[PDB]
Write a protein that binds this ligand. Structure first.
Ligand SMILES: CC(C)(Cc1nc(-c2ccc(O)cn2)no1)C(=O)NC1=C(C(=O)O)CCCC1
Lengths: 56, 217, 286, 339, 233
């Protein structure tokens, strides 16, 4: 009765009170994160064969 | 070149040999899938084979190993784990012939059979239909008519006619008539016969698979 | 010649019927067997079709060497090439026909074991075992055919030079009897396998599922094609043997025809070789 | 008291949630990412191919060292693959052959395994005996096991086929915390980099952010219109990708709890089985049912490249912590490394 | 984990004996075996090796051909058949387990061994700098050694091991690949090297650390031992 309905309502209301930020700020943060680690990604940028452990 | 990795390569080769042996053993083993509604009928079927999650049963007949997998107790959406049974040699479907008098159950069994038969994953695997509770079905027919759950039924109120009508209704649900074959059978009290029919169906499907592998089928 | 009594003829009939049928077999075999070999190479390589691929390569070897025989026939009994080409071509022809017959028998046995005996170790045989058995089947034919690779240069004819190795010589040596066996024993094996397959398949099934008789008809077609393409050249050779025993020591009174007849019905071997891909590979839906 | 009031209250609450989401949605990620140059075509070669599996492969995981990976298949065998040398480090014979999930502990000492059986078996690899045994059996679930991922040497988060997700203790072997927020079958599971939050996908076409310690979920996303088949956390930890049978990938962020972009195309009509990000998260790799794999740009939503080395359904896809290579598993019984 | 060995005693010169060892508590089949002998006054010396699959059987140059090693996996025992023994053959033989895979710790466990008395080039050498060093409790001591050929393989793994042989007991592994500590080794132990010169540091010396320290090289298979440094408390 209340274990699956009242508890669900309380859970949802707890979810509803969390502060939120604008989508633009999150997008900017994500873009900055990708830009900062652009050179640290072996896949995004080509890696020399010597540095590649899988090179034949 | 390698100095210490050669031992690792030898160990990998040994592991590969063991894996190949185990795979050959598994291929020699024959896989069967058990499906249907009603715990009593499936329990009777598995008990008739003479030597929690999924219950796996192992038994041998005519020097052929048989593996049976129980999925009735899984209690999960079939759309997410039925693809794991792609390589099953055959599928056994067990339905209680007396379910027509209990609450609609026969309609649910027919719906499940239609869903399994038309599944894209089982477009080639054969299905074996086991009609349980023969004596109980005869008693129910002599007590209640089959027209209760079959409005379209119009025929003699006899055990043979009712059984034939039920079989015909079950078979027509197989849309892939050419690609798939249904080995319907009636369960009997005496032992050594249901297992014999299962072995015959498995032999037939294995012959089909071998012919297809060769190229003829 | 040959330290025996060989009685080769010269009939003005070969240059009439042989060239057309030989060219037709050329066209319909090179486009058929080579194409099937290309499909096999491009496209799982389990033992099911390893024997079929070996048969295909043997057939491709059979008709790729044909030019030389076609040259022998167009300029009748006029062979310009050397000893090495003649021995190589005779060896290749004999080897290819031997391999084709042996692989037909092997495929028939494989089907018989895959149908009559569904539960057997031979059904799930390993790829390496198939490779080794194919190598042994090739090696036996190599050993059998190596006997004629050491012969001399093209035989004389009081003029142009011949090398056919069949002739009508009265020595009844081992190779002709072996040739007879190559049609007798494999024919019996294939017929027994087909009969047992029919008995085991019609008894319990084949009442429906059109894909089953679609293949049984092809099996019967294979058997009928074998008997029709390899029986005439054998019965004619039995008649040659009978004439050999009933005559010959008296300077054969022009057996004639029968030799011509043998050499025209010999085209059935190449006909069967050319139609093998359509009957075996292209027939299978896979 | 009655559904006629509780359901209406829930509907009004969902209305408020949607209104807040619409108000917060000021600019889509698509038009804000046009100022950055496109990644361009990416070509990946199969440096190594791993063979030895004789059944359909369903799951694989990469180790912390980014050299050893564990693979699972229906034949009932776990193989620890040395990607550098393609060596078979270990071969664990599974008691139950019905397995479709596996995991590797961050420390590399234990490997988890499960499937249609209700046990997320734990195996010890660094034992003195030299043979692999079952450290513990976690048979506290009812439905089929879907995915259990290690949290530490003693804690593992498990998602089963029922509507409940549970957290297990290796030493105790008891349900430390059980999550029952989901209303449908749970399929996908992924953990945040900080090992404090995790997101579980379910067939109800929704994803929920769960708290490892708190015990109750904090966000719910219902962008997808079909069962949620795959999920993976973004490296930054503030977002996670998602694969589904709808044939599209949706990116949801933890803070703004919106649906940023939908990766879809007319050509693709089949579902997505596994999804994972790269080290920087720019490249999103998703495994599709058809005989190929696709790389999606996390910001531009363009087809960066196609990995068509497989001939059957791709069932798993993992990227190393180092990020030097990507392993793609499929139903071909072979594993291929792309980079 | 236990390794019981037997087959010792007085042996007449030129005779033949069948050394046997019993393995229990661990997978004998999956683990390779090495045979190591100790001279009464000198250090240990490798003798022979047998792999898990009973293949790649290797012998030292001084026992090549003369010695043969066989194992019985179902019997869970190891055997060493030695024939035509000479005066210098006398030594204390040891049974050593070993496994080979990524992250493995070979030579981790050593058998107790049994005494054996007899009535009367192109190998990597280990030039140990010192044969005896004086130490006191609570102090730090450094042990160094030199190798003729650099042990830094092309894969970046250096094949160096360290062993501690306390008096009255068999040696035990301390560090393998000079970057990883074996099971049960206190964390105070540390090792480092440049690929050709190796230094072993033992900080916070304890009474149980007394003994003699041996080294290893595993690049070329004709394994050779070190001179040995004796620690006196
Ligand atoms: C050389 C051969 C094959 C006759 C022969 N074969 C064998 C033999 C021995 C052992 C064995 O295992 C199989 N075969 N011995 O002699 C032959 O007839 N060449 C020619 C024709 C042809 O063959 O197409 C076309 C024109 C006529 C000449």
């Amino acid at each position: 009765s209340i274990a699956q309905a009242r508890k669900l309502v309380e859970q949802l209301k707890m979810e509803a009170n969390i502060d939120r930020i604008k989508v633009s700020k999150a997008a900017a943060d994500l873009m900055a994160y990708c830009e900062a680690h652009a050179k640290e990604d072996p896949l995004l940028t080509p890696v020399p064969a010597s540095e590649n452990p899988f090179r034949e | 070149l390698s100095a210490e990795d050669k031992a690792a390569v030898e160990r990998s080769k040994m592991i590969d040999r063991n894996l190949r042996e185990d795979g050959e053993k598994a291929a020699r083993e024959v896989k069967l899938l058990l499906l249907g509604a009603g715990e009593s009928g499936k329990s009777t079927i598995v008990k008739q084979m003479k030597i929690t999650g999924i219950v796996e049963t192992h038994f041998t007949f005519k020097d052929l190993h048989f593996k049976m997998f129980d999925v009735g107790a899984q209690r999960s959406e079939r759309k997410k784990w039925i693809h794991c049974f792609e390589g099953v040699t055959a599928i056994i479907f067990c339905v209680a012939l007396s379910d027509y008098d209990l609450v609609n159950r026969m309609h649910e069994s027919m719906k499940l059979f239609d869903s399994i038969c038309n599944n894209k994953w089982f477009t080639d695997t054969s299905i074996i239909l086991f009609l349980n509770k023969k004596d109980l079905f005869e008693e129910k027919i002599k007590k209640s008519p089959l027209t209760i759950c079959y409005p379209e039924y119009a025929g003699s109120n006899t055990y043979e006619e009712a059984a034939a009508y039920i079989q015909c209704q079950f078979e027509d649900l197989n849309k892939r008539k050419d690609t798939k074959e249904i080995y319907t059978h009636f369960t009997c009290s005496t032992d050594t016969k249901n297992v014999q029919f299962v072995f015959d169906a498995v032999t037939d499907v294995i012959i089909k698979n071998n012919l297809k592998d060769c190229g003829l089928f | 010649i040959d330290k025996k009594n060989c009685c080769v003829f010269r009939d003005d009939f070969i240059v009439k019927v042989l060239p057309p049928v030989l060219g037709l077999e050329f066209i319909f075999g090179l486009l058929g067997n080579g194409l099937a070999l290309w499909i096999f190479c491009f496209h799982s390589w389990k033992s099911s079709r390893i024997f079929l691929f070996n048969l295909a390569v043997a057939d491709f070897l059979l008709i790729i060497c044909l030019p030389f025989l076609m040259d022998n026939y167009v300029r009748r009994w006029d062979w310009k090439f050397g000893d090495i080409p003649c021995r190589l071509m005779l060896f290749m022809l004999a080897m290819n026909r031997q391999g084709s017959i042996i692989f037909l028998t092997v495929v028939a046995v494989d089907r018989y074991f895959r149908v009559v005996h569904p539960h057997h170790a031979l059904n799930k045989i390993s790829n390496r075992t198939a490779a080794i058995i194919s190598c042994l089947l090739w090696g036996i034919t190599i050993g059998l055919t190596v006997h004629l690779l050491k012969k001399k240069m093209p035989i004389q004819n009081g003029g142009a030079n011949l090398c056919s190795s069949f002739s009508i010589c009265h020595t009844f040596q081992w190779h002709e009897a072996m040739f007879l066996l190559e049609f007798f024993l494999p024919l019996g094996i294939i017929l027994f396998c087909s009969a047992r397959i029919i008995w085991s398949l019609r008894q319990r099934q084949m009442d429906r599922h059109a894909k089953i008789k679609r293949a049984i008809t092809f099996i019967m077609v294979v058997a009928i094609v074998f008997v029709i393409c390899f029986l005439p050249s054998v019965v004619v050779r039995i008649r040659i043997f009978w004439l050999l025993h009933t005559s010959g020591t008296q300077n054969c009174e022009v057996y004639r025809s029968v030799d011509l007849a043998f050499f025209i019905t010999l085209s059935f071997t190449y006909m069967n070789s050319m139609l093998d891909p359509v009957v075996y590979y292209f027939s299978s839906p896979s | 008291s009655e559904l006629d009031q509780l359901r209406q209250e829930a509907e009004q609450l969902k209305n408020q949630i949607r209104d807040a989401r619409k108000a917060c949605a000021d600019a889509t990620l698509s038009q804000i990412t046009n100022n950055i140059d496109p990644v361009g075509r990416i070509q990946m070669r199969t440096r190594r191919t791993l063979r030895g599996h004789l059944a359909k492969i369903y799951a694989m995981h990469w180790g912390t060292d980014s050299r050893l990976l564990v693979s699972a298949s229906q034949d009932g065998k776990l193989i620890i693959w040395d990607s550098y040398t393609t060596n078979k480090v270990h071969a664990i014979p599974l008691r139950s052959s019905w397995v479709m999930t596996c995991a590797y502990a961050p420390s590399g000492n234990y490997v988890a395994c499960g499937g249609l059986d209700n046990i997320c078996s734990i195996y010890n690899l660094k034992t003195r005996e030299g043979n692999v045994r079952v450290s513990r059996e976690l048979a506290g679930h009812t439905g089929y096991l879907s995915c259990c991922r290690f949290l530490d040497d003693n804690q593992i988060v498990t998602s089963s086929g029922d509507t409940t997700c549970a957290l297990w203790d290796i030493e105790t072997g008891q349900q430390t915390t059980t999550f029952t927020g989901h209303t449908g079958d749970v399929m996908s599971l992924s953990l945040a980099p900080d090992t404090r939050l995790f997101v579980s996908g379910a067939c109800d076409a929704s994803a929920k952010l769960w708290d490892v310690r708190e015990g109750m979920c904090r966000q719910t996303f219902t962008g997808h219109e079909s069962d949620i088949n795959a999920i993976c956390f973004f490296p930054n930890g503030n977002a996670f990708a998602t694969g589904s049978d709808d044939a599209t990938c949706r990116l949801f962020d933890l803070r703004a709890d919106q649906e940023l972009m939908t990766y879809s195309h007319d050509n693709i009509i089949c579902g997505i089985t596994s999804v994972s990000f790269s080290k920087s998260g720019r490249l999103l790799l998703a495994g599709y049912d058809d005989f190929n794999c696709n790389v999606w740009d996390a910001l531009k939503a363009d087809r960066a490249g196609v990995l068509a080395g497989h001939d059957n359904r791709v069932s798993c896809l993992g990227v190393t912590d180092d990020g030097m290579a990507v392993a793609t598993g499929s139903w071909d019984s072979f594993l291929k490394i792309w980079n | 984990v236990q390794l019981v060995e037997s087959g010792g005693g007085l042996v007449q010169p030129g005779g033949s004996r069948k050394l046997s060892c019993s393995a229990s508590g661990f997978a004998f089949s999956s683990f390779g075996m090495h045979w190591v002998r100790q001279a009464p006054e000198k250090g240990l010396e490798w003798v022979a090796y047998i792999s898990s699959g009973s293949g790649t059987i290797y012998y030292a140059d001084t026992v090549k051909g003369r010695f043969t090693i066989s194992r019985d996996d179902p019997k869970n025992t190891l055997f060493l058949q030695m024939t035509s023994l000479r005066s210098e053959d006398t030594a204390m033989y040891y049974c050593v387990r070993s496994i080979y895979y990524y992250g493995s710790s070979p030579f981790d466990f050593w058998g107790q061994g049994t005494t054996l008395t007899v009535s009367a080039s192109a190998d990597i050498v280990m030039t140990q700098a010192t044969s005896s060093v004086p130490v006191t409790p609570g102090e730090s001591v450094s042990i160094s050694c030199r190798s003729s050929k650099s042990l830094l393989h092309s894969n970046g793994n250096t094949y160096l091991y360290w062993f501690l042989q306390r008096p009255g007991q068999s040696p035990q592994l301390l560090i393998y690949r000079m970057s990883n500590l074996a099971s049960g080794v206190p964390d105070r132990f540390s090792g480092s090297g440049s690929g050709t010169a190796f230094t072993l540091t033992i900080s916070r010396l304890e009474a149980e650390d007394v003994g003699v320290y041996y080294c290893m090289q595993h690049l070329e298979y004709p394994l050779t031992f070190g001179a040995g440094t004796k620690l006196e408390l």
